[PDB]
Design a protein around this nucleic acid. Structure first.
Lengths: 347, 347, 347, 347, 349
RNA sequence: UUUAGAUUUCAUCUAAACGAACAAACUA
RNA sequence: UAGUUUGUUCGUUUGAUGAAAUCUAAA
């Protein structure tokens, strides 16, 4: 089976997600909110933050994938346009990551199976943990596959260590969060390039993942630079920041932002609330009064960033560096002066 | 069975009202409107003019009664608070006639059967045209019953000649619209008084229903007054009106309003758009510029009104008159001078 | 008193407009609508079509002026900014004519009396029918005054015969709809120019107001021109219209449109629904299939238009003619060829 | 170009439709309504009756086609999924007839030109009146083309004599409303079948288009049957209607409905307000009390319907008839007895 | 009296709630929000989160009860349908706790006094700290009464120590928050069953209320089990939790969630956001990746839960155990092998 | 018509075991 | 081809809940 509003709310009340049970409950739809009648009074079940209708969004939210799914930025960078027989929820913007669906909700479905002729020119996302999806990927034209194990005849591309589980990004211990990504374009199995993966952390809950990051969050600016021989790579401005002018200087890695927030809190106005490899913020340091309207921030592994920046040439006045990060190319604006770097920030 | 939004919408799309079939259709709920996707584009099915939530009101409208039911004013004067296993629609305000239901909608249900203890202090409306409802009325504590035929052991009260059929009031020819009303209060079958019934007409679609009304619409004022010996009863101002001052005079029967409308169109602003025995309108005569803010109109049969007014006494300066109209008492303000009438407007 | 939502709704329920009575009724504000509970069910009182809040517009509409008031276009052309101690409802757009009030509603009041200093750089509209406003007008700095009679020391200007009474524009018989307009700017009593007045009619209820208009709606085009010696003034195209090409020609008077609508109905799309001396319509003729996007239509009296067009000189190729209509200058684009007129349409 | 809400509203205010000029006006968006500030007060320009956002719907409504375009149902039957560089407005449901656009609005555009790769698996509607579109139709894969004249190398199909102009269905006299339809499928020029075209009339504005229709609207039932020898085809119930029982019988042509409406008005509750070759109405006769929930009505030409029905065989108990009407197959359920007919309702 | 949106907003602006003062202010209603104009600009007074009209919900919210009142779960469990001459606000869902009112709001009133015949088949909640409300309880047919002290001729039932003061549950010191509950059904006084009371705590502000809870938050799992002789009662799973497999095991007491949260924060999704004895959560362990779609959590005192689980019979394969908590029966599902408990989890919701 | 009890069938249950099937990881 | 771990599905163990149906008893 029954595709209806009240069965979905039944499953939400009784199981927390649309599991497929049978039964119905009272439902009220007022404004963009879905209420239900429990003990004679109306309890809100879902408030619609999306641009879909209320019941469409409520049904999509209830049928969201509760397994560990890849982060939305990885799926966007791989070019995924639609997901086969599942809804992938974007908790950053409280909406589905993809506009249409395949065999999920009648209002959004462009097909009931990924093998129809309308899904052919679209990179479908196939979940190899679900039985029967690997063969669909094999017969598909454009698609992306993730698998915990190995698939015969296909060279795996090992993905990021972390994945989103119910909106929480974690490196799984009780569950596998590291999948092998296979991408097929026009019936030709492409090999994904060797990439770096961003760590997906945040300022408040920042935990270092390497001894170098521990040294960064622990040692002083001079001690850390001297210890790792980072002289002449402008780490004082690239990572630590410059809180002395009216405009904030540098600070284009999340680890430096976390260190500053530990020293003195500030304000990050994420004026585009979406998940991506490179984020822009509106920072305003509350102590010095130094603010910058746009600050491009990418949360690489500090060891990986060191490896990248030490593999460059400080010979030209400026150079744009192409690096594959999260299965996509990121262009870095390098401005290296004679023997030093004036600035090096993502664009 | 299934009670859900999409089954209701399937029934509405396929049959125009909820019949009880099985099936579902895609449905969008935006603002107070229910849309369905037909041929790939969204077609509006219902716009909520009520104060209920959209899906509640949509279900109630889908499950409205399609058989000829008594007019809402008759039920209100009979004190009906709720209906048994049916929904009665007030087409004047595009909202259900009663606040709660019995065994129709999960959200508005106070009970599933009219014999539950919660329904005992409520005058339920039983429809004798449906089987088993007469036995429910006998087993009810407080209830009102209508019957096309006769019920054993109960004294009928002959109701009005017309009934409402999908918002169209008519005197049914192919179908019966004259019902016998039975009322029971605290388990005691009470006999309703002898009453006069309002004809429930309008100005634009006005048709006379007696010889006297035909004379009124055709003969002049003096000819009509002389022919029916209506001298000494202020029929010039009470019925025809006075379009000579800045404030309109009299005009308290729908027949004279219709005569004027045939003479000259004007404006009737019904500031309380609901069905009742006595209606107040904001008249603005577009020809003479005479407007009256509040003007009570009661659409009686002219013969019955003549009988009532000739059953009066022209002795006192003023008197309040009690007339049972539509199973309820109507208070008439009669300002009559010595042997003549100054004015006569319902209160 | 008491200024409250429930008292306003009490007056609307009991009298149709805010009369100043004392009392309160239950009210519910859902969407942009105000509902009141009568006989246990909610009856809608006011649906908000304006851009004000619901209670604000409900209070303004209840306190609207129900006497014969000047039409909105006359007050606009006179530069009226606000009305003193009254609310003038613009029924064309179902919203107040003026953005603020003086001593009406706390949410819009810029003052409680028109004598305050904030009202000084504003043309306030004073109603001479309300006692005391003429003295206020004399003491005012900028203002407009209407008087049924005469005001000592001020030369009256005769306004149009018709006036708006509850949204119905009428020439009063039992009420006076003709006023004397006075204007004062910077404390200086200005004299209004001699003007022609548009009759403010419509196609559907079009009634001629002179013998010349009677002949127009009766005689043929060639007979009418010959009888009134309208040869050489392009009355075939200016007035009657040219339903022959894909683009409609001329038809810049309401009387010709009314003649055609009597001959054959069409569609007038008023894409700027507001009261103005010159109206632009989107004509689409349903018989000939000729549609014009913008067709400026001015509802002059036919005799006055003839008096206008016979005061012209048919010598220049093109001319912009200034005619003061409704207290404002209206620019006519006149194209006249050798001895004739090519076109003559309002700008 | 400039693509902005203010430029669109400037074009709408100055010209009534988006012509392509330059300028901006103040704009407000409250609820689903767009207002503009004319003379200091807000004037509503557009009320969104669609499911799209307000500004998207406003931009589409402004950019609608104001030339005579084919009726919507023809485009649906031909399988049109999108229109190239134009917007076709479905005035029955006050929304665009196609969900996406090409080169119109950035919010709905799936492509900027109809030649992109995403447009290939879609039947694009090309108008030959716009220069350069025939070359596009030749190189398109799936498409439909209309032309006033003829195209070299393509065999035309003569279209219906009526085309919709600004929501007015008319037979063009000053302009051409008859196009030649060319349809291509998968790069292959398909030939459209010979079809009978519905007239698209209405009850109130019903005008006969043949002498037979004149006789139907003038002669009585028996006289019309006798004159045209329509015995043995059950024209008494098929067209004239059966207002004798509680349920309406037959009445599946618009001509009989119009005749009855002339005799006595009734209700047409169009529960699905959209344009199609066959329409269903919820009829409730106000005079006799006869109401039918579903009544499938097709407005064929009476001569064409006579030609079709006299080509049938009255020898079977039941039969399904495939009649190509408006470029689509219509199934007719003919329950005819031995020389008589039980019922004949289109499906 | 005056009953109007402008007088109500005047009281809100001047005094915070509805005190019954006289006066008015300019009020604007846009969306589900009530705005008031202070110094030429509009200020948001109240955003409507309910299913009621904005002005109705604003009038109810203004006239809410500011004294310590019982938590809404206690009133639901005792069966209260309506409140006499007061509004009980549900801060867990920002809406009135009861559908209709008695003598409060003309739009929601079913009666102006609880003695009318429409209030007879409803358990009207009667306060005792408002004079004359006890005698209304005695004349009532169905109702619930609370009292700080004693009522002559009635047997008190001592209720929970905590009460909700303006949405803050607290064991009062300056103001008394322990009431005596009296229930009356069909005109007959009913003795309430002896119950345990959930402590109404939360994860972030968790404070132990007994020595056993201090030991639980301080000691290790094995040390605690050995000290309190809880071997064989599945305390490793029922209370502590089992973050080893893909689906979370156990963790049915709020104190265990508190210990885990202090060790390592996780996510609770309240997919039915209301107030009840047993809460269902969508727990996702942010550390191990362990999750559970429905995880029934009850906030009993640890000593009381130990007392409950030590009085079960560990013989049957399974048994549904009915425990009276907050004046209602809570069904605990008991699975136990021979001499050891497999699991014991609440089920409600 | 209302209520209580008994019986048949279906779905569910925040634990485990068993058997089956599929897939991945370790191994022979 | 076989043993162990993990994930998905089906059925059994144990008590109960809700629904559809049947019968009995009481008012």
């Amino acid at each position: 089976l029954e595709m209806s509003l009240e069965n979905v709310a039944f499953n939400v009340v009784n199981k927390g997600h649309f599991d497929g049970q049978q039964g119905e409950v009272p439902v009220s739809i007022i404004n963009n909110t879905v209420y239900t009648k429990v003990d004679g009074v109306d309890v809100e079940l879902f408030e619609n933050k999306t641009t879909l209708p209320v019941n469409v969004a409520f049904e999509l939210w209830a049928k969201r994938n509760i397994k560990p799914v890849p982060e939305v930025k990885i799926l966007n960078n791989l070019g995924v346009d639609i997901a086969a027989n599942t809804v992938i929820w974007d908790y950053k913007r409280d909406a589905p990551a993809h506009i249409s669906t395949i065999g999920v909700c009648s209002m959004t479905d462009i097909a009931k199976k990924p093998t129809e002729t309308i899904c052919a020119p679209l990179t479908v996302f196939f979940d190899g943990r679900v039985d029967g999806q690997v063969d669909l990927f094999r017969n598909a034209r454009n698609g992306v596959l993730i698998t915990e194990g190995s698939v015969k005849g296909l060279q795996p591309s090992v993905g990021p260590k972390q994945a989103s589980l119910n909106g929480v990004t974690l490196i799984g211990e009780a569950v596998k969060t590291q999948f092998n990504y296979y991408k097929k374009v026009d019936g030709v199995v492409q090999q994904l390039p060797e990439t770096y993966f961003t760590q997906s952390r945040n300022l408040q809950e920042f935990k270092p993942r390497s001894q170098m990051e521990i040294d960064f969050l622990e040692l002083a600016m001079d001690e850390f630079i001297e210890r790792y021989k980072l002289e002449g790579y402008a780490f004082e401005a690239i990572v630590y920041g410059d809180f002395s002018h009216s405009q904030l200087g540098g600070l284009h890695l999340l680890i430096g932002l976390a260190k500053r927030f530990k020293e003195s809190p500030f304000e990050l106005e994420d004026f585009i609330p979406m998940d991506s490899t490179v984020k822009n913020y509106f920072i305003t340091d509350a102590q010095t009064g130094s603010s910058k309207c746009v600050c491009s921030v990418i949360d690489l592994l500090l060891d990986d960033f060191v490896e990248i920046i030490k593999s460059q040439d400080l010979s030209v006045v400026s150079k744009v560096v192409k690096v594959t990060i999260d299965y996509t190319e990121i262009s870095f604006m390098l401005w290296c002066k004679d023997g030093h770097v004036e600035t090096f920030y993502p664009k």
